[PDB]
């Protein structure tokens, strides 16, 4: 039979059968209970709208993501999300399909063990396998080397790989991602008068960020230009009218990636953690990693980031090496495409964690040889 | 006539949504074209420089 | 109602004569011959009560193929059989669902036209291709060709 | 065909479908009985000493426990299906109900009943 | 305790569904009687299992039909 | 059995059995004791004529409404009105029929508790339920969202509802209604010479208001036109002759709704309290409320109000949103039609306050789960 | 209501025309982008060969 390539993610759940080009169903991972009282009788009001249904009734819900930073903080809601994904968005019972979840690097063990225990006890799948979210993004590019920066919505991690041999001592995981950029944008919008507070209006600020923000090639020059002319002010229409005008908030929101001091984080930007991740590698594979830097994940879709990052790394790196940044147009679904490719391989067909194996060793089987 | 008006409204809404999507797609692809053209110009300059280096060396 | 509509459609002497005598009694002010809306309301008022004329007008024009404020023959039969609900709407929901799921041999939740006409052949009743088209168009609400259980019940209304 | 004629046509259609359902259920019962006969195979009892009967009892108890766990599984599946079909039926009702409130009238009595109330026992056919 | 609830549920499935077997105290003849009783029990249990399978099939069929009707109406 | 859908209202009591289209008996709610001496013996003179009987003998009575502003100020008279409604206008003993009263939003608790105590002790009904007068008017329109402005004769209240979930923090109740318009019309008629003082002549002024007054589309232009031409002066024949001619009093009486400063009230008109009620709602359901504004209640029957209100709201609202005002022709009985629909529902059949429940918890049961 | 329905249908027609034009633009730009991608690949191969020759020299 065919395998189910699910990809929990944090912000958008992407799923679909193995062997295709794009995920079949992509929908936000939010579960929102209603918060008001409700007076109409017999309206058929449910107790929790999940997935894309709660992005249409969000006016009277309190949306809450069940995955904070890669890790899962609310297991009941995550179980509800998985149940919805299997039964309503794909309509395939899990009793007859292997599953291939994905997990960020350096995550707590208990999260992974609970994930496998749920998949084997509640949904009762035949066999499931957990894979690191960066190796798949390297599969999708058709490479076999390269250092991949997978800046998702929950957590940004940077896994270097050479000739198929991952370097476990050079993984640099940073917890700045799309959600923190949304919060920072929502916080700097208040400098013009627009106040978004409700958890429903966070979605509106996310839409503003997606449609308007861009990464500046040079930060100081843009700050000077936006403060003199008015060629940058782009307007946007809220879900009820009252258009708003975003000035130099456009390139200040995604600039947080390269200067995490804006949101008070100490660490260095995504332009310098890649160079540090390279320098921890051996001295003889640094040229190949320099030449095959891969971008993935949703947050790396800002217009103009593949040039800013290249300029920064070229500034840091030695002058002789060639710096090349692979930015495929299908960046958002790169991890899932790689997952489909991996699940479609014949050599991989014996790596699944078969159910009888789980019955013999318990949920701690995932840390064992079947990784 | 009210039902007719509702149908007209929904058709207009769908058409506008498709128009917005096409606008976004064209914007993205045009940005890609601009970036690639700049890269090609720089590459021609680099190629001339490399040939000069070959000759002198 | 279901028995009465069929009986009065091609009735013998008795109850049609009863209707004629009812009109003969109704001539005390209303004598239009073919019962119009005003004569119908006058008859209902002279009966001795003041019912809401909405039911009367629904009887007199709603089920009609004309709706001209007048009373037809089969239209009056529907008016007579419409006070009660004896025709069991073409079986019950459980029976209709069972017959539709055995009808849905393809188990797709819809009846395609091919299996529809094959079942119609399996019926063995009187054949009427125009009636087949009418039933299909009753199933052409979204006009997807296939007929779901909703439209199936829709043209199964009053099937006795 | 007349409107009543096509109503009788669909009535015969429903009768044919009901007969098909009856034969479906009959064949279902017969084939499932035969299939159980294939599984639930009678075994010899006589001629066996104490040890053979004890071993047979142990095998029977093990099979009982196994098929009982399997029955629990299929019953849980059946319960899930019942819940899901109930939810789907309720959703169908919501999409095509509730707002279906008709003209509830207490003055438009049954034509027979109304005629009797206004005339005595004049209405006796309907 | 909900996780504990499901774990004790499946534990009771594994344990209570098994019943009390007592055949050694039953003499050869009483052993035959016990074997007959267990034979009927297992055969009836498999009959229940098959009926559950068929009922689940019919319920899933109706679920498919209702969901398809929902898709048509939406 | 069938349920009794009574609707106390303030000015017209509307009642009838559940499941019909229109209330069976509609009659003013006034109780008038005779005031003169009375010399004929044996004439069979009663001590209090209630309902529609006191609108024919009003020449020698002192009519007094038992309901001032939604609240009930004279419980004995209200009990008399209910007794009349049950026994003479419907002729059904209450011992065998559930009742469904209606109550304005934000009313004093004691009023509701006394109402239920009366219905359970004096009339001894099997079960009664109290419903908010706006949710019913939303039922009758066949909607499930929308913001309903129910401008009755006692009190005007504006309840917004979305997807069946009422928003309790956005109810704007204003005490200007038909009665204050009657008093203001009676006060401005004195500018031509016609003086109405007696409580019986208030009914004549009410008839003048109903038959002649209309809401102007633009107030200043109408004031200028009525002051130059004479195309507006419509005449009306009193109950004894001596026709009167109403000039620009025609559109000045109902203009008080949009400018409550005329009768000295501070608050803003019904055109601006609706916009304020909308703006208190969440940012994502404002479009739906804009598109589904519902009118109900008697006082919204003025010829030309559904255009003035739409013009005003379109002036206030953002230019992109579409403003639509639902004004069904059966506006007056909208609340009662909705009440009939609600009482006819099967899902609602277990929400009644059964008598044994009242016996166990006292009259304070109404504030509890059975709302 | 009739006037509003007519205006809505006209709006829908205009939006459909705009969508068709956007489709045309998108396809044209996509073709141009593919051509320039091939050109850039040729640039890359030229650079590789020049680099190798430079190393040898
Ligand atoms: N076109 C875009 N432009 C800018 N940011 C985007 C775009 N699309 C998505 N994002 C950001 O990326 C996030 C989605 O990232 P995604 O790759 O789905 O995360 P995950 O790894 O959990 O799947 C969104 O929250 C959004 O903030
Ligand atoms: N046709 C009409 N035109 C103008 N005003 C009216 C009309 N009918 C009723 N009214 C006003 O509305 C009031 C009746 O309102 P109603 O809806 O009966 O109040 P309630 O909510 O108490 O039932 C009357 O006092 C009258 O002033
Ligand atoms: Ca007619
Ligand atoms: Ca079919
Ligand atoms: Mg990801
Ligand atoms: Mg009212």
Curated annotation (Swiss-Prot), chains A, F:
Changes after translation: Oxidation of Met-40 and Met-43 by MICALs (MICAL1, MICAL2 or MICAL3) to form methionine sulfoxide promotes actin filament depolymerization. MICAL1 and MICAL2 produce the (R)-S-oxide form. The (R)-S-oxide form is reverted by MSRB1 and MSRB2, which promotes actin repolymerization.
Protein name as annotated: Actin, alpha cardiac muscle 1
InterPro entries listed in its UniProt record: Actin, Actin/actin-like_CS, Actin_CS, ATPase_NBD
Chain's gene name: Actc1
SUPFAM superfamilies according to UniProt: Actin-like ATPase domain (SSF53067)
Enzyme Commission designation: 3.6.4.-
GO biological process: actin-myosin filament sliding; actomyosin structure organization; cardiac muscle contraction; cardiac muscle tissue morphogenesis; cardiac myofibril assembly; cytoplasmic actin-based contraction involved in cell motility; mesenchyme migration; negative regulation of apoptotic process
Cell location: Cytoplasm, Cytoskeleton
PANTHER family per UniProt: ACTIN
Organism whose genome encodes this protein: Mus musculus (Mouse)
Function, in words: Actins are highly conserved proteins that are involved in various types of cell motility and are ubiquitously expressed in all eukaryotic cells.
N6-methyllysine, modified sites: 80
The protein's assembly and partners: Polymerization of globular actin (G-actin) leads to a structural filament (F-actin) in the form of a two-stranded helix. Each actin can bind to 4 others.
Residue list for modification Tele-methylhistidine: 69
UniProt key word Cell division: no
Keyword hit for Nucleotide-binding: yes
One Gene Ontology term of the molecular function aspect: microfilament motor activity
UniProt signal peptide: none
SMART domains xref list: ACTIN
CDD domains: ASKHA_NBD_actin
Family that this chain belongs to: Belongs to the actin family.
Catalysis: reaction(s): ATP + H2O = ADP + phosphate + H(+)
From Swiss-Prot, chains B, G:
Protein localization: Cytoplasm, Cytoskeleton
Modified residues annotated as Phosphoserine in this record: 3, 15, 35
Superkingdom: Eukaryota
Induction note: Induced in stimulated quiescent cells.
Other comment: The sequences of cardiac and skeletal muscles are identical.
Function (record text): Binds to actin filaments in muscle and non-muscle cells. Plays a central role, in association with the troponin complex, in the calcium dependent regulation of vertebrate striated muscle contraction. Smooth muscle contraction is regulated by interaction with caldesmon. In non-muscle cells is implicated in stabilizing cytoskeleton actin filaments.
Family the entry assigns: Belongs to the tropomyosin family.
Free-text comment about domains: The molecule is in a coiled coil structure that is formed by 2 polypeptide chains. The sequence exhibits a prominent seven-residues periodicity.
Subunit and interaction comment: Homodimer. Heterodimer of an alpha (TPM1, TPM3 or TPM4) and a beta (TPM2) chain. Interacts with HRG (via the HRR domain); the interaction contributes to the antiangiogenic properties of the histidine/proline-rich region (HRR) of HRG. Interacts (via N-terminus) with LMOD2 (via N-terminus) and TMOD1 (via N-terminus).
Protein name per the record: Tropomyosin alpha-1 chain
Swiss-Prot record, chain D:
PTM comment, free text: Phosphorylation by STK4/MST1 alters its binding affinity to TNNC1 (cardiac Tn-C) and TNNT2 (cardiac Tn-T). Phosphorylated at Ser-2 and Ser-4 by PRKCE; phosphorylation increases myocardium contractile dysfunction.
Gene Ontology CC entries for this record: cardiac myofibril; cardiac Troponin complex; cytoplasm; sarcomere
GO MF annotation terms: actin filament binding; calcium channel inhibitor activity; calcium-dependent protein binding; protein domain specific binding; protein kinase binding; troponin C binding; troponin T binding
Region (Involved in binding TNC): 1-39
Species this chain originates from: Mus musculus (Mouse)
Job description of the protein: Troponin I is the inhibitory subunit of troponin, the thin filament regulatory complex which confers calcium-sensitivity to striated muscle actomyosin ATPase activity.
Modified residues (Phosphothreonine): 11, 38, 89, 103
Higher taxonomy: Eukaryota, Metazoa, Chordata, Craniata, Vertebrata
Site residues, Involved in TNI-TNT interactions: 40, 57
Subunit structure: Interacts with TRIM63. Binds to actin and tropomyosin. Interacts with STK4/MST1.
Residues with PTM Phosphoserine: 2, 4, 110, 126
Keyword Isomerase listed: no
Segments of this protein annotated with the region Involved in binding TNC and actin: 89-110
Protein name (record): Troponin I, cardiac muscle
Family membership: Belongs to the troponin I family.
Disulfide bonds: none
Full protein segment contained here: 42 to 167 of 211
Keywords: Acetylation, Actin-binding, Muscle protein, Phosphoprotein
Domain of life: Eukaryota
Keyword flag Zinc-finger: no
Swiss-Prot record, chain E:
UniProt function note: Troponin T is the tropomyosin-binding subunit of troponin, the thin filament regulatory complex which confers calcium-sensitivity to striated muscle actomyosin ATPase activity.
Coiled coil: none
Record field: compositional bias (Basic and acidic residues): 1-13
Post-translational modification: Phosphorylation at Thr-5 by PRKCA induces significant reduction in myofilament calcium sensitivity and actomyosin ATPase activity.
Residues found modified as Phosphothreonine: 5
Protein name: Troponin T, cardiac muscle
Organism: Mus musculus
Family as reported in the entry's similarity comment: Belongs to the troponin T family.
Superkingdom in the source lineage: Eukaryota
Disulfide bonds: none
